[PDB]
Amino acid sequence: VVKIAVILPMTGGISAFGRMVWEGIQIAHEEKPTVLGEEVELVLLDTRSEKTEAANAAARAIDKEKVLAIIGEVASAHSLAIAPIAEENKVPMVTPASTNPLVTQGRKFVSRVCFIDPFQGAAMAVFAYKNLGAKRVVVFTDVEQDYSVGLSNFFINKFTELGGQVKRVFFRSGDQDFSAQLSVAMSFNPDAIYITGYYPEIALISRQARQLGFTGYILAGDGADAPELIEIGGEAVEGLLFTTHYHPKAASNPVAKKFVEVYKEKYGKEPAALNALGYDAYMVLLDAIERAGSFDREKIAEEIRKTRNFNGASGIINIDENGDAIKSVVVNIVKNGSVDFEAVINPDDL
Amino acid sequence: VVKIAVILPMTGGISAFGRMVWEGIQIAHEEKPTVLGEEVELVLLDTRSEKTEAANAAARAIDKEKVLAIIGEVASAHSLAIAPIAEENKVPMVTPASTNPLVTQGRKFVSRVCFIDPFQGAAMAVFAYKNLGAKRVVVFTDVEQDYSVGLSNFFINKFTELGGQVKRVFFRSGDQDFSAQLSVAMSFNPDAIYITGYYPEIALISRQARQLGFTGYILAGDGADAPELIEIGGEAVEGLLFTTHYHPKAASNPVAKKFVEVYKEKYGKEPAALNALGYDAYMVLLDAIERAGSFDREKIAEEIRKTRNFNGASGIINIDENGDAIKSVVVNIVKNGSVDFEAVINPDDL
Numbered sequence: 001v002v003k004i005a006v007i008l009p010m011t012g013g014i015s016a017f018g019r020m021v022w023e024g025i026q027i028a029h030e031e032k033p034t035v036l037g038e039e040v041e042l043v044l045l046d047t048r049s050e051k052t053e054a055a056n057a058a059a060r061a062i063d064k065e066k067v068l069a070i071i072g073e074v075a076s077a078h079s080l081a082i083a084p085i086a087e088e089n090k091v092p093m094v095t096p097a098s099t100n101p102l103v104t105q106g107r108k109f110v111s112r113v114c115f116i117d118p119f120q121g122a123a124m125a126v127f128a129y130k131n132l133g134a135k136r137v138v139v140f141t142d143v144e145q146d147y148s149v150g151l152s153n154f155f156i157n158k159f160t161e162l163g164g165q166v167k168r169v170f171f172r173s174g175d176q177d178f179s180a181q182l183s184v185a186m187s188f189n190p191d192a193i194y195i196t197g198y199y200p201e202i203a204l205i206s207r208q209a210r211q212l213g214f215t216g217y218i219l220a221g222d223g224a225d226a227p228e229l230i231e232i233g234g235e236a237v238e239g240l241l242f243t244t245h246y247h248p249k250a251a252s253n254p255v256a257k258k259f260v261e262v263y264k265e266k267y268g269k270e271p272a273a274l275n276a277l278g279y280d281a282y283m284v285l286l287d288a289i290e291r292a293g294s295f296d297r298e299k300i301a302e303e304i305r306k307t308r309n310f311n312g313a314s315g316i317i318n319i320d321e322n323g324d325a326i327k328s329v330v331v332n333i334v335k336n337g338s339v340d341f342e343a344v345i346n347p348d349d350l
Numbered sequence: 351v352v353k354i355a356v357i358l359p360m361t362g363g364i365s366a367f368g369r370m371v372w373e374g375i376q377i378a379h380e381e382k383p384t385v386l387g388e389e390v391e392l393v394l395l396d397t398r399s400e401k402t403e404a405a406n407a408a409a410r411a412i413d414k415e416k417v418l419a420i421i422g423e424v425a426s427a428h429s430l431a432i433a434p435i436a437e438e439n440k441v442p443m444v445t446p447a448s449t450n451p452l453v454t455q456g457r458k459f460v461s462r463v464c465f466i467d468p469f470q471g472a473a474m475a476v477f478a479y480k481n482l483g484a485k486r487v488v489v490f491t492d493v494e495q496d497y498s499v500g501l502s503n504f505f506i507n508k509f510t511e512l513g514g515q516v517k518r519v520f521f522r523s524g525d526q527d528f529s530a531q532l533s534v535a536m537s538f539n540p541d542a543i544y545i546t547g548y549y550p551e552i553a554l555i556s557r558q559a560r561q562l563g564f565t566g567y568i569l570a571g572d573g574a575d576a577p578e579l580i581e582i583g584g585e586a587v588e589g590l591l592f593t594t595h596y597h598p599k600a601a602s603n604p605v606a607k608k609f610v611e612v613y614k615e616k617y618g619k620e621p622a623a624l625n626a627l628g629y630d631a632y633m634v635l636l637d638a639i640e641r642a643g644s645f646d647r648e649k650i651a652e653e654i655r656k657t658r659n660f661n662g663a664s665g666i667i668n669i670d671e672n673g674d675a676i677k678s679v680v681v682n683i684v685k686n687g688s689v690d691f692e693a694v695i696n697p698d699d700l
């Protein structure tokens with residue numbers, strides 16, 4: 001009788017993200033289908049990878065479906081469309097994977113189980129400058145995506161604070177031709193390009209950059225982290241380095257090791273960050289409901305922000321008083337058509 | 351030899367805004383063409399009403415043109431595209447008219463001469479509820495515009511805090527057909543619709559709403575404030591109420607009264623908010639340069655944030671330590687094909 005809206009991009013341009021989160025949520029829900037002795041019903045609502053439809057879905061979840069809570073979205077732009085709707089109506093929301101700070105900032109009811117972009121940006125800035133010796137970087141920003149605009153800003157602040165130099169170019173979600181931007185990019189004689197958009201554009205930029213003769217590093221954020229990156233990119237994304245939340249071979253706590261084996265058994269492949277993050281969004285929400293001891297939405301919201309030492313699939317989850325999780329950045333690299341662990345950057349290493 | 355980039359939408363969907371700001375900047379520059387004994391050169395850069403091109407223009411202003419400072423943009427989305435570029439490169443920026451808080455938040459080099467949207471939203475929420483007796487409002491949000499998304503949030507927080515009820519619908523910049531949203535809107539039996547987008551969509555929503563038989567209030571924000579609203583809207587925008595920054599008949603201080611007479615002499619019509627705001631962005635920047643006593647960008651940035659008791663065309667300008675101006679909201683109304691003063695809401699009246 002307890003309903004939880006699951007608001008995800010199951011179709012459209014970033015549909016891989018909805019698939020990956022849903023797979024993890026489904027595993028969690030099969031494991032823990034009830035809370036406080038009541039059956040939990042998931043209400044899956046497809047955003048179609050659109051801002052308007054994310055907003056519409058959240059409006060309907062609250063006005064029509066009368067949900068207790070919301071899990072979603074993935075793209076920061078889409079979570080930003082719905083976070084105000086959740087807050088205005090005092091409906092607890094947990095995003096598995098939106099990293100832009102503004103999702104939770106100034107809100108009580110909206111929280112996340114992942115890191116935020118000041119850290120994700122700073123981490124790649126340090127990695128690039130210190131570990132790769134990159135000094136000249138062309139940063140490609142997707143102007144349509146709040147996630148991209150923010151991450152680029154946070155990377156650039158740190159990279160230039162370190163003494164690096166940057167050139168900025170701009171594109172839109174949906175673009176197929178990056179000739180103008182790559183022409184500007186190459187004239188800067190970069191050591192690396194850093195792309196803060198999502199896998200469809202990252203893959204196409206990478207093919208076009210390599211076709212041009214670019215032999216430097218291609219770097220990206222967590223937007224890269226879908227197997228589709230490799231499916232589209234092929235050889236052009238070999239050696240691509242990206243920040244994300246997770247690598248299955250790094251699983252350490254017992255819930256994380258178990259999630260690897262359960263996911264492997266069902267799917268015949270290693271899980272990825274968004275699988276683990278989906279599982280954690282669900283389990284954290286239900287853990288919070290149990291601590292609240294009732295279905296009072298204000299107490300549930302309060303308890304989400306008191307989550308401490310929680311063994312999650314994606315790591316140990318600690319949620320701060322702003323609704324942001326204290327989590328490590330994982331740097332991964334594409335090698336031979338799959339994803340290898342490269343490094344872990346904990347908050348203190350910066 | 352001193353160059354100031356003026357980054358405005360001179361063409362595209364919101365071109366009226368660039369025209370109106372430019373007219374005011376041109377008046378200011380003719381009045382005060384030099385600073386610290388040096389000639390000021392304006393570098394006009396057209397954003398074409400696009401996020402990508404706003405970003406490109408700012409990148410070129412800084413990388414290629416080596417400007418001292420930037421005046422612009424108007425749309426919060428476009429100012430948000432460029433504010434990080436200004437900040438990263440320590441180039442002082444003054445927006446005449448972007449109201450979204452995030453433009454200046456967490457930055458030292460970016461400031462504005464206008465109010466911010468927590469106040470603009472709250473002001474219409476109080477006006478609607480207390481003055482118009484509106485209790486049921488359908489809020490139309492343009493999902494593509496950071497300005498709209500923010501203002502809608504701020505209006506709704508205050509309107510519902512007062513006890514009002516809201517239904518949310520969603521559209522995109524460029525849309526021509528609002529039948530789906532108006533159908534949802536009317537089923538809520540609203541006393542008013544409040545549209546937080548720009549004049550092109552506000553006008554079309556208004557025609558379609560009236561054609562449907564809607565006899566309630568149509569309310570909007572400062573996005574309404576272009577004569578094009580009336581040119582497109584006709585009878586359908588009669589009685590439309592909107593928040594803005596200014597009314598020429600309210601001019602009070604001597605710089606504001608003079609600006610009215612100078613603008614009238616040149617153009618044969620009363621000035622509007624964006625004319626006055628353009629003039630003020632320029633005069634405030636030059637006032638700050640004079641107080642700095644040199645072309646040191648850090649000192650100029652510091653002085654912009656110390657502006658106090660400055661007689662501007664748009665009112666007395668006081669800029670806080672966050673780069674936000676303490677300014678009053680003006681409520682105007684369309685009557686007989688022109689704009690009448692309806693009320694002033696000072697910060698304390700809330």
Ligand SMILES: N[C@@H](Cc1ccccc1)C(=O)O
Binds near residue numbers: 017097099224225
């Ligand atoms: N962090 C990205 C979403 C994302 C997370 C993890 C993997 C892929 C995508 C955002 O906020 O938009």
Ligand SMILES: N[C@@H](Cc1ccccc1)C(=O)O
Binds near residue numbers: 367575
């Ligand atoms: N305040 C609007 C811009 C605007 C101001 C004044 C008049 C018209 C438009 C924004 O931030 O996008």
